[PDB]
Design an enzyme around this catalytic site. Sequence first.
Site, PDB file in Angstrom:
ATOM      1  N   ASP A  44       4.007  16.739  11.641  1.00 17.41           N
ATOM      2  CA  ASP A  44       4.186  16.284  10.262  1.00 17.41           C
ATOM      3  C   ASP A  44       2.846  16.179   9.533  1.00 17.41           C
ATOM      4  OD1 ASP A  44       5.755  15.564   8.053  1.00 17.41           O
ATOM      5  OD2 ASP A  44       5.680  13.423   8.539  1.00 17.41           O
ATOM      6  N   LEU A  49      -7.806  -0.317   8.150  1.00 17.98           N
ATOM      7  CA  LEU A  49      -7.516  -0.157   6.731  1.00 17.98           C
ATOM      8  C   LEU A  49      -8.315   1.011   6.172  1.00 17.98           C
ATOM      9  CD1 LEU A  49      -6.065  -1.229   4.159  1.00 17.98           C
ATOM     10  CD2 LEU A  49      -8.155  -2.610   3.771  1.00 17.98           C
ATOM     11  N   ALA A  90       9.049   5.943   5.960  1.00 16.81           N
ATOM     12  CA  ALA A  90      10.424   6.331   6.222  1.00 16.81           C
ATOM     13  C   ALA A  90      11.269   5.115   6.599  1.00 16.81           C
ATOM     14  CB  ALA A  90      10.484   7.377   7.338  1.00 16.81           C
ATOM     15  N   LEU A 108       0.802  -1.211   0.000  1.00 17.86           N
ATOM     16  CA  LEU A 108       0.000   0.000   0.000  1.00 17.86           C
ATOM     17  C   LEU A 108       0.840   1.268   0.000  1.00 17.86           C
ATOM     18  CD1 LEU A 108      -2.733  -0.886   2.632  1.00 17.86           C
ATOM     19  CD2 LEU A 108      -2.741  -1.436   0.206  1.00 17.86           C
ATOM     20  N   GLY A 109       2.099   1.188   0.404  1.00 17.18           N
ATOM     21  CA  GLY A 109       2.954   2.355   0.394  1.00 17.18           C
ATOM     22  C   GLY A 109       4.291   2.038   1.023  1.00 17.18           C
TER      23      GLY A 109
END
Lengths: 404, 404
Positions: free
Chosen positions: A129, A85, A22, A18-19
Amino acid sequence: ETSVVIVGKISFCPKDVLGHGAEGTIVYRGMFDNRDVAVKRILPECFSFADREVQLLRESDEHPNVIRYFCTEKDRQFQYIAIELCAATLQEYVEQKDFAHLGLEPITLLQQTTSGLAHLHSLNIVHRDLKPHNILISMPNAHGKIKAMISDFGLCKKLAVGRHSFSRRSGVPGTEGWIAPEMLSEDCKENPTYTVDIFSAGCVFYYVISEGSHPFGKSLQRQANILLGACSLDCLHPEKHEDVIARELIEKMIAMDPQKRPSAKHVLKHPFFWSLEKQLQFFQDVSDRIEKESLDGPIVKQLERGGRAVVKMDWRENITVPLQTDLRKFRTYKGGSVRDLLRAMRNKKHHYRELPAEVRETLGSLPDDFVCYFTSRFPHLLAHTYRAMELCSHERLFQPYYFH
Amino acid sequence: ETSVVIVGKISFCPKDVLGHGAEGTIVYRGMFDNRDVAVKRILPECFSFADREVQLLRESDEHPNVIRYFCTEKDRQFQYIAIELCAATLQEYVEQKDFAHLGLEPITLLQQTTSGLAHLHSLNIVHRDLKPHNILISMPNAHGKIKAMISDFGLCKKLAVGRHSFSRRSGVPGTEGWIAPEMLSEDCKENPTYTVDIFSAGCVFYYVISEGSHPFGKSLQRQANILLGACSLDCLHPEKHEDVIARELIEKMIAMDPQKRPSAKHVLKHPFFWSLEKQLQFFQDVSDRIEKESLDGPIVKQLERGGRAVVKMDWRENITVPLQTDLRKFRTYKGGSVRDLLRAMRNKKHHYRELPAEVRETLGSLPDDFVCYFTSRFPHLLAHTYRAMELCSHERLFQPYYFH
Ligand SMILES: N[C@H]1CC[C@H](Nc2ncnc3c(C(=O)Nc4c(Cl)ccc(NS(=O)(=O)c5cc(F)ccc5F)c4F)csc23)CC1
Ligand SMILES: N[C@H]1CC[C@H](Nc2ncnc3c(C(=O)Nc4c(Cl)ccc(NS(=O)(=O)c5cc(F)ccc5F)c4F)csc23)CC1
């Protein structure tokens, strides 16, 4: 013929990436207790922080606009964090959408994000952030509604009790283009505080309602423009009522002086989030409040300061002809007075039911069409009145409209 | 030297028993993923029931007033269900002497409970076992606040698609006292529906505000009186404003005809839940609506039907002397008229800032003491006006006050 990985009660398919986060962390789609989850894999050099992070979100009070934590598992090599999710990021929502069929869903989305942030701040947690990429859009519930959720607490700080600020000793947490200017200043005497999140959220607000633009330009020069104060809100035209109100809030959220930014709870009270009915109710409460105020008093002088531009020199000349005809049968209102335009609104609203059918026709139905009749013709009326009536903001009548 | 049981990711100390029940049921305090939880142990003769009900709890638990489920473990002998650890039941809240409310008073509790119930019914889930023992009171959050939560989902059913009803074959609680009559009778044409929960909620409502009493008696006579229709709300006094309003709502909730019971969302719209300011706004909107209405029109006629008891013959004689002195200028206000009482209230609300200090002093501040000034003196005024103005319930201005 796909492969599964099972670590305790957490399972995921390595192909469903999904991604990437860092430090070479990967996020997978997976399962936990037969719930759909997202599963973040972290490295051994991260086990100490992840336990601190999990302990923060496992122990903190649940909130509908903060992401829901479910379970952590550790194996011989990695830790895995399972959370609710989500369907998309706010970034994907803004890139992949057309804000005609959505209506007030963009503004509801920003209000949910702001509620989540006010919840963090009241727990003494600064996110540091905030950005569209880590504001998450839920899967549709059983009724098809969705919501915004704050995630990604790796850069956050929990202030010690009694502290209202934090020092820069850790440096600059954040993502280039969303970092408050006081974070990147050599000569700034004042420690950063919760308002670094307000500045980031302000940029997010503009990013959403402009459908992709940033107040400080394109990403390469974006953070340099922040340090210079070189912002631009072009997509908000200064003669459309919705855009005037949105500009009034966002300019303060991204203000260079940190102490001039409203706290998250202040943001939520701004007229940017008012329904049509509440705006008209505010106009009525104001008109009632100043009905017996002298023309020389501080409240009315404030309300008339700059008033002729607000009413466009003579508001009786900027309204529809059936309402002009109806205003002449009675006592004359002063065409250059903001107070009198509010008095006319309150009077036509209070006597709506007995107005001639021609007048109810051009005003439209109460309250939605009625209030837009005035705000679309006088796009600065509400913003100017809101700012002027700040003088009464501690009185009981005006509590729903301001924040103390 | 105390023993610890570990079943999968659930653990508990068997010395920390929290409750016992039927079918060999035991609840313990325990842990899951390092949270405090309650752990319920059930028998193999419940594996079949349990999984179906855990899934329904998992589909409902995101609402803040539905108990949060955490984990379930199957054991070589038993099944164990871990949910959010709570501090008390509603029963303990009502019956314990100095139970600290911790910023949660009876009305907010009932509204939280109904919000949870409305969430269930909107998922087509009927609870079917609503009673004080299985409404739980949370542990205080980080801000010291508590809330109420529905639990005990062991009997809850998801209705089949297209059905608004279920049959009495499989899901009637073994412990009675709080069960809608159509669940237990035989001479019953209509099948039970969501309104079984409203009937139980009606009994809970009375139980909370009466501070421990049941509408249908004590222990064994309860269910017998429910089947008989023999109820009594005698803790709700006829000359106290709050009790009149409460009685008008509870009465429809525990009504024998299930079709006459308001839905959970309708309950939430009832003036029982209106803030003081909303009640004063209802009076103003009514008074404005009838200002030009014909004295012989249906609306005013309806408003005056039984008006003498509502105004106590002469409302001018049942108000304070300073307000009497101030109404002397308004000789057009007839003391036998409910409408004129409403007109005087609206007039003194509108001109409140201009009234002499004597008048403001007996009325109290706007809006709370002001509206209580009148409802405490005319305890039927709100309930009567509410019922009377039902004739205007489809008009946009009266949308917020009714349920369509
Ligand atoms: N194209 C679309 C894009 C959206 C996709 N859906 C997603 N749904 C849900 N999560 C994600 C993510 C994602 O990073 N999650 C994530 C994960 Cl799993 C674990 C930790 C953190 N951060 S945390 O602070 O450590 C943290 C610790 C806690 F104990 C509780 C919450 C926390 F946040 C985190 F943020 C990336 S995408 C996506 C679907 C496909
Ligand atoms: N003096 C105070 C009193 C309150 C105490 N605190 C508590 N906190 C939290 N829960 C409790 C409880 C308590 O029963 N929990 C509970 C638990 Cl653990 C699991 C399930 C259910 N539901 S179910 O119907 O059994 C049920 C059966 C199924 F097969 C499937 C699903 C179900 F849902 C339940 F309801 C009893 S006390 C207390 C602290 C001491």
